[PDB]
Design an enzyme around this catalytic site. Structure first.
Site: not given
Ligand SMILES: Nc1ncnc2c1ncn2[C@@H]1O[C@H](COP(=O)(O)OP(=O)(O)OP(=O)(O)O)[C@@H](O)[C@H]1O
Ligand SMILES: Nc1ncnc2c1ncn2[C@@H]1O[C@H](COP(=O)(O)OP(=O)(O)O)[C@@H](O)[C@H]1O
Ligand SMILES: [Mg+2]
Ligand SMILES: [Mg+2]
Lengths: 48, 489, 463, 463, 129, 129
Positions: C153, C179-180
């Protein structure tokens, strides 16, 4: 010996259609249950 | 100070005013920056009003003023061909509108004794709708289905088909992106349908108040022609967005909800609006216009649009709306994705006015088609677990398949009364029994083309009058036989 | 003309001003002596305003003095933000010096009117063969990205940024909603490993942030993309800008969390009453005007595997195209792993793309579906039952499957292959020739990893 | 003295009086300078009462003056109301002058006591096959029709009126509660075209009216019917009365719409806490006593096709015969879509209808239940593996559900076929022959939309 | 290395405290920041670079990288993998290991359900062999 | 022998009275003490010893015992015996007699379902034969 496999493939297709419809009904019921529980919790909270 | 006040609280588009003693219910209030509001709650010592615009420029301590008038919008023939917002202000850039009148937005429909029965047909151009779910002047008909099923296309085709009948049209867009509205306006303008059509727009970025108020303004605009002996037609796009906006307003007003968190009076909101479409009698017209127009009846047709989730017609709001209108057209995704367009479900769709809203020839020819189609659908569904089939079942199945394939059309391609009549006669008398199933569309197109080529006076006569006689039927049968004998498809 | 704190409950703070100095909605306030910005949410009366704190609230206390800016949150905009990393307030967090530019733009602004809309529906060229033929894009539209990890992705994101910078001379903005930190650091170093960092700006919002930050982080990227779109060169051409949103589902979740914190009655399945309005007001500023156009690409996650849920339905109310990545395609080594039979776009319509494009796409899809059907009989009953047109379909479908892969520009550093940017006109010619049966003698391997039909001819003449 | 308005919210208004002139609970008040009437609901103390307006509240302001009448709402009764149309307040709306009587009766009154109750001891034929066979009516009893939206409640009601009320020797009252105005106009002109307008009285409050009108509109028709029931003549006996009510569900819906504004707490799924009490108060008045009898037919709406919903579930216990319509039958083209496994009647016992009728009904229901049981194994598996008796049961049940369809007289516009009337003796003959097995060679297509078994034989032979 | 016994009990205690503190409840009476409760705890398990260590210790430690690993545990009831807190937690981690009662009752001692258990990091966290 | 024809309607009336007095509701809007309402009524039916009768009558009645049997009636919605009210009554009472719609429509009359019908007293309340 050549008709049993026709029988089983038809049965499998019918089972797939069945599980599709059952999944639709399950999703509807799950959404209804979540809404009812949230409404009950809010109503209980407001009454105090 | 009897007509003055000050803003006290501001939150989420709803403000609180303290001081408007001589304030009425539904009265219009103007703020300091040129904005307008509508009173909703006349509390003991406060007033609650929604803001009709952008409220970000309002702060506590400003001034408020009563105007002494209820909500109203301009009306007249000057609005045709323009694009306006929910308050009637133009947004197309062509300049101001010069309408000579105003009209209140909230009204009550005429009573029982002032109405008249529906007997005048309205043509949408679709072969299935005309011969299975007829629509008449004054009727209210519902278009319901899932997303991306072809509802707006049907509505636009119905608007386009009124080119010659001389009836006015109104299009209301609620909760839509601006680009889609621009595309629809462009398509209407290219075909010339914009010459007699008005567009009211409430985009997805507009406040909930305007999306909740737009359909009433559209109906008020459309009622101008009904009250003066003419005919009109109004389309409500995404009537569920109005319910969503009303639910948002009610919930932000902290009111207890019901099924699916909707308010208690969600039925009244739609019943109050959809009851205004009707057909009035000559006496009502004469009393309204003080004898200026006599011997004329007015009408107003409505085509609301509602979307469902996963084809669930048993939901709260779809059933709440089905119980108000005089019928419904159901569009199903299963037939749409399978290549049957338009995907009209014969077993679910119904019309309450019936055969009295269509011409004599179509009424006589198209009788019992829908029930037969539903019976064929049930029989085809059941006949998968058997191999020994009798003659009647086979004949019924193979006739149902041909009937199903006959009702297939393309968008931007209207049909005439004569074409539907001749096709229905060909199907009813078993002239397509020996035709292969996959050549039905070619057969129909070739038959229509040849019949127009070689029998122009008959087609013209059927088009103008739409009557049925023995000699007409004999001529139709002779022409069908002549096409079958010589022409090839 | 100053206020003070009177109440702190979690992340909700009430401030009382003087009756002739009350600020307005969405204004930003500054706590004197600390570094905390308060955003106005609603007024209550008697000079009391209820706000939200951007960041953590440990250490604050009642009675502290606060002063108003009389303006919304303004972030720096310009070309100096290319290659940098900033937070929701427009401050660097990558330890690379302050942002040089002085220009500022408020993050709250009305959407463009109906009169400013474009007068046509153009197409956005990407260079990817599979995308441009089966799920074509459109300027000003919105595209949803499906499929989880393990199929590629981020690489597709790199390729899209690089191609849009190369062909149309456009820029890009990346906003990370929840987001991580590990995956975000990996992505940042992945861009830095290539030479794509200098043509894209980042604003990052991570999971361990207060829900206010995760809600107002897409507006900063939206403002930056708006400024990039609006500025014009000689003759006022304008620019095409790509916007990346990490996950719109987490945007919705932050919205409902903030609504619950503010104390509003829930609706439907636990969601906030203002779901559709919020998402529309977010997606109504992404459109194509006369000057330029902003296009957005967002990742979509379907909760509970039920498309009827309110948030996926409200999402699908606006999406013009969906791209789904399947692990089965990636298992065969055909990259990018994009399923042809399940990806859809509203632009694939004879009115928009023409007659031949639509017919070629439909024929390709039909052949692929028939091949999928014949797979079961091939596997179960044996090969012998299949011959003549069944094997013709099999061979054509295999060739089509191989032909959908192409090398990328961002992977040239690893494998050495320079990659190709196939124009749209070339793909239609190749697929139309393949369907007609002109290349029925070429071996399958010649269709592998090649840019255009001429490269297939060269590989066939070599092999 | 007079009070003044102090607060208005939607349809609910409250007035403030002096401490010595507070009106009673169900009094009527008039707003000076306006045609608006208010009905008191509660007493809140300090000389304040809460009322409900009987019209639109637009143009109403705080501080107006209100005068009391010291009486409930009174409406005219007697023979002067025959052939006229009235509203909730008893005012003529047919443009035919004023009502020519002087007697008045309050619309609120207590129900008859336990000692003045009678027992219905007479059957009543209708000419409808399924109703006659499986749900017989009783002269002087209560009938209810249950169904969802668009399943055939109005058509069946009109057919019942055509079959019964036309051959009647008495009076009739028709009440419209929240229905379509077009239907009311059509019914009025249909009655006026014939010469039966002199035997009926009509009250109309429809869905376009405020909730105040819809709340109390049934009580007016009930009062008229009550006066006609307890009416005697010098040397002349009483008269039988037929009463028709349309969508009694709208009464409870209107009660729901104003519950929150009156200050109550919701129960169940957003319903008012006094649902059963206010349903029973109205239902106990529709009854037949020692002095006079009433035969009533009501239409009950089922929200969202849910028979478990509290309103129909509460309503179920107030009726003697219950007819249930199902959408599954209607969507298959079978009219009338009456469900034979959910329709019951108190008259179906061997002591009332005889042995043969009871045995026929029981056998039919048993066969239908067995087929419904077999459906699943027929569907998922094949049909060959079934026992021969099961195949016979399937064929007989399909023919049985075909034979329950009938063309109506009032449905000639929809289909174009003339109506049929069937005496119950022919129905019993045909069903006994069908269950015996005499018609095992007739195709199942010949049983669709016919009258007696002779028509079945003729249609089969013609095939 | 840190082991969190059961985060569900922590969520239950948090719900009880929030309700006792009269905060506006959400789904299942949970407050509005349960995700904020779990995600911000799980974000502190990380591996830091050598420059961070050098800055923190003012040069006392030169070429070392720190780390911290977590192994949270979540319990289900007859495979209800779609509840509120378990889904919140599953959205945050970098992998999952599934154990089912039908395996332990059958007699499988590890009872690891390999069908739906995956590791995102993969082969980089292993040795050559 | 006493018979209550519908305890559900009594519960509904009690719920209406409780809601009109503004008491906090619970599941399905019923008040907290519906279980108390039914239990303190159903616990009054039992058998008493001869000493109790002797003491109550002051020696008027000498060698006899007394009893009071109860037969309450409960109606369910679509065969859902897991609702709030029926479960309390099921737990309170000794035995249950279940009647089914499918058996009734199939000709089995009365419609007793022997699969889930129990009597805890059992054979101790039977004649010898
Ligand atoms: N008769 C037809 N034959 C073929 N294609 C059709 C037909 N009618 C409509 N379509 C196409 O099908 C699609 C349906 O689009 P349309 O806007 O009509 O649907 P909708 O139900 O209004 O969708 P939305 O949910 O976006 O409002 C369009 O691409 C349209 O061109
Ligand atoms: N016996 C019948 N024959 C043909 N059509 C019928 C019959 N009964 C009902 N219908 C159709 O069902 C629709 C619903 O009828 P109606 O009772 O007026 O609405 P509702 O059921 O919502 O009250 C009508 O439009 C009519 O066309
Ligand atoms: Mg549309
Ligand atoms: Mg109905």
């Amino acid at each position: 010996q050549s008709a049993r496999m026709v029988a089983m493939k038809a049965a499998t297709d019918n089972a797939g259609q069945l599980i599709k419809d059952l999944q639709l009904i399950y999703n509807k019921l799950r959404q209804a249950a979540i809404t009812q529980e949230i409404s009950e919790i809010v109503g209980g909270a407001a009454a105090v | 100070a009897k007509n003055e006040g000050t803003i006290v609280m501001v939150s989420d588009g709803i403000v609180r005013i303290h001081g408007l003693a001589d304030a009425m219910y539904g009265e219009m209030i103007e703020f300091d920056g040129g904005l307008f509001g509508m009173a909703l709650n006349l509390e003991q010592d406060s007033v609650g009003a929604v803001v009709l615009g952008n409220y970000l420029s309002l702060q506590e301590g400003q001034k408020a003023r009563c105007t002494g008038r209820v909500l109203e919008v301009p009306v007249g023939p000057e609005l045709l061909g323009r694009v306006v917002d929910a308050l009637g202000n133009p947004i197309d850039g062509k300049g101001p509108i010069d309408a000579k009148l105003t009209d209140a937005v909230e009204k009550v429909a005429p009573g029982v004794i002032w109405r008249q029965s529906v007997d005048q047909p309205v043509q949408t151009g679709y072969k299935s709708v005309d011969t299975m779910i007829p629509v008449g002047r004054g009727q209210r008909e519902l278009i319901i289905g899932d997303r991306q099923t072809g509802k707006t296309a049907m509505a636009i085709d119905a608007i386009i088909a009124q080119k010659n009948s001389g009836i006015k049209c109104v299009y209301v867009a609620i909760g839509q992106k601006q680009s889609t509205i621009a595309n629809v306006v462009r398509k209407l303008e290219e075909t010339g349908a914009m010459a007699y059509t008005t567009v009211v727009a409430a985009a997805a970025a507009d406040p909930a108040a305007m999306q909740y108020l737009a359909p009433y303004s559209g109906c008020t605009m459309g009622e101008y022609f009904r009250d003066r002996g003419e005919d009109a037609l109004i389309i409500y796009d995404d009537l569920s967005k109005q319910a969503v906006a009303y639910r948002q307003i009610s919930l932000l007003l902290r009111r207890p909800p019901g099924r699916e968190a909707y308010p208690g009076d969600v039925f009244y909101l739609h019943s109050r609006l959809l009851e205004r479409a009707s057909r009035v009698s000559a006496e009502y017209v004469e009393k309204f216009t003080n004898g200026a127009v006599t011997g004329k009846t007015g009408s107003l047709t409505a085509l609301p649009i509602i979307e469902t989730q996963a084809g669930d017609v048993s939901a709260f709001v779809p059933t709440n709306v089905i119980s108000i209108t005089d019928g419904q057209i159901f569009l199903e995704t299963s037939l749409f994705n399978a290549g049957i367009r338009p995907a009209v479900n014969a077993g679910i769709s119904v019309s309450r006015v019936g055969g009295s809203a269509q011409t004599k020839i179509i009424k006589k020819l198209s009788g019992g088609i829908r029930t037969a189609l539903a019976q064929y659908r049930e029989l085809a569904a059941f006949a998968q677990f058997a191999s020994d089939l009798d003659e009647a079942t086979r004949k019924q199945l193979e006739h149902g398949q041909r009937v199903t394939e006959l009702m297939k059309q393309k968008q931007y391609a209207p049909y005439s009364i004569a074409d539907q009549a001749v096709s229905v006669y060909a199907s009813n008398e078993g002239y397509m029994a020996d035709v292969e199933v996959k050549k039905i569309v070619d057969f129909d197109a070739a038959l229509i083309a040849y019949f127009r080529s070689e029998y122009a006076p008959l087609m013209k006569q059927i088009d103008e009058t739409g009557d049925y006689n023995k000699d007409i039927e004999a001529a139709i049968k002779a022409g069908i036989e002549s096409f079958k004998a010589t022409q090839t498809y | 003309s100053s206020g003070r704190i009177i109440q702190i409950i979690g992340a909700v703070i009430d401030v009382e001003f003087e009756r002739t100095s009350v600020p307005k909605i969405y204004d930003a306030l500054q706590v004197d002596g600390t570094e905390t910005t308060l955003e106005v949410q609603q007024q209550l009366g008697d000079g009391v305003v209820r706000t939200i704190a951007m960041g953590s609230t440990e250490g604050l206390k009642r009675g502290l003095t606060v002063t108003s800016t009389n303006a919304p949150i303004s972030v720096p905009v310009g070309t100096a933000t290319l290659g940098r990393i900033m937070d929701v307030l427009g401050r660097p967090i990558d330890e690379a010096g302050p942002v040089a530019t002085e220009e500022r733009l408020p993050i709250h602004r009305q959407a463009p009117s109906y009169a400013e809309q474009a007068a046509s529906t153009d197409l956005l060229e990407t260079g990817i063969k599979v995308i441009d033929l089966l799920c074509p894009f459109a300027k000003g539209g919105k595209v949803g990205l499906f499929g989880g990890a393990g199929v590629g992705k981020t690489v597709n994101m790199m390729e899209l940024i690089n191609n849009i910078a190369k062909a149309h001379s456009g820029l890009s903005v990346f906003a990370g909603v929840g987001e991580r930190t590990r995956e975000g650091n990996d992505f940042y170093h992945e861009m830095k490993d290539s030479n794509v960092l200098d043509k894209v700006a980042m604003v990052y919002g991570q999971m361990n942030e207060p829900p206010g930050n995760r809600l107002r982080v897409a507006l900063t990227g939206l403002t930056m993309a708006e400024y990039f779109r609006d500025e014009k060169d000689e003759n006022g051409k304008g620019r095409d800008v790509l916007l990346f949103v990490d996950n719109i589902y987490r945007y919705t979740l932050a919205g409902t969390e903030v609504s619950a914190l503010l104390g509003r009655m829930p609706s439907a399945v636990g969601y906030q009453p203002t779901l559709a309005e919020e998402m529309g007001v977010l997606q109504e500023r992404i459109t194509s005007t006369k000057s330029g156009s902003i296009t957005s690409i967002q990742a979509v996650y379907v909760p509970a595997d039920d498309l009827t849920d309110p948030s996926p339905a409200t999402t699908f109310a606006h999406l013009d195209a969906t791209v789904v990545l399947s692990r089965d395609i990636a298992s065969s080594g055909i990259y990018p792993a994009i399923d042809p039979l399940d990806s859809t776009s509203r632009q694939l319509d004879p009115l928009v793309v023409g007659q031949e494009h639509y017919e070629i796409a439909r024929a390709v899809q039909n052949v692929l579906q028939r091949y999928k059907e014949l797979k079961d009989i091939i596997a179960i009953l044996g090969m012998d039952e299949l011959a003549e047109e069944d094997k013709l379909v099999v061979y054509r479908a295999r060739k089509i499957q191989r032909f959908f892969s192409q090398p990328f520009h961002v992977a040239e550093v690893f494998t050495g292959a320079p990659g190709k940017l196939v124009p749209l006109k070339e793909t239609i010619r190749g697929f139309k020739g393949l369907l007609a049966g002109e290349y029925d003698h070429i071996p399958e391997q010649a269709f592998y990893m090649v840019g255009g039909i001429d490269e297939v001819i060269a590989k066939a003449e070599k092999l």
